[PDB]
Design a protein around this ligand. Structure first.
Ligand SMILES: O=S(=O)(O)OC[C@H]1O[C@@](COS(=O)(=O)O)(O[C@H]2O[C@H](COS(=O)(=O)O)[C@@H](OS(=O)(=O)O)[C@H](OS(=O)(=O)O)[C@H]2OS(=O)(=O)O)[C@@H](OS(=O)(=O)O)[C@@H]1OS(=O)(=O)O
Length: 127
């Protein structure tokens, strides 16, 4: 079943738009925020648009984008927190510790600027 991913940062909702831009919006009633993430392995996720069909990917520059094709850059790893919010990692760029993050202006974040402890790094699934 669907889920909205609520970022603690500014109270936005991860949004994959059809062109492939990933940002957050605070208009919970929007078509593109509905997200469906399936576990493809032990603590390994795939978040994907319920509407457009595309995927959450992060290129080798740290920019999260929407991909048509599930490809090596679509597996983020889930990791529950102490406060019960998640934290998704790029699996291709784990080494680096590049996460999924939104800024307080909506602009998605760059993997090479996601540090453990940011309020950006935390997302919390809602129905
Ligand atoms: O463009 S911004 O809007 O982000 O304007 C701020 C630029 O400064 C950064 C520097 O990078 S950082 O060292 O990793 O922080 O971040 C600092 O300011 C932003 C601005 O907020 S805003 O909502 O984007 O307008 C804060 O970003 S955010 O994560 O809060 O959204 C940074 O906070 S934090 O690092 O994430 O905790 C803040 O730095 S700090 O809190 O003092 O450490 C760049 O934003 S950043 O990449 O998100 O950090 C901004 O330039 S950038 O092109 O947006 O990256």
């Amino acid at each position: 079943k669907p889920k909205l991913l609520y970022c603690s940062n500014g109270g936005y909702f991860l949004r994959i738009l059809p062109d492939g831009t990933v940002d957050g919006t605070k208009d919970r009633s929007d078509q593109h925020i509905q997200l469906q993430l399936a576990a493809e392995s032990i603590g390994e996720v795939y978040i994907k648009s319920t509407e457009t069909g595309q995927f959450l990917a992060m290129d080798t520059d740290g920019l999260l984008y929407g991909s048509q094709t599930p490809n090596e850059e679509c597996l983020f790893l889930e990791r529950l927190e102490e406060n019960h919010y998640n934290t998704y990692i790029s699996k291709k760029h784990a080494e680096k510790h590049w996460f999924v993050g939104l800024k307080k202006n909506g602009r998605s974040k760059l993997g090479p600027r996601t540090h453990f402890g940011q309020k950006a790094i935390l997302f919390l699934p809602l129905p």
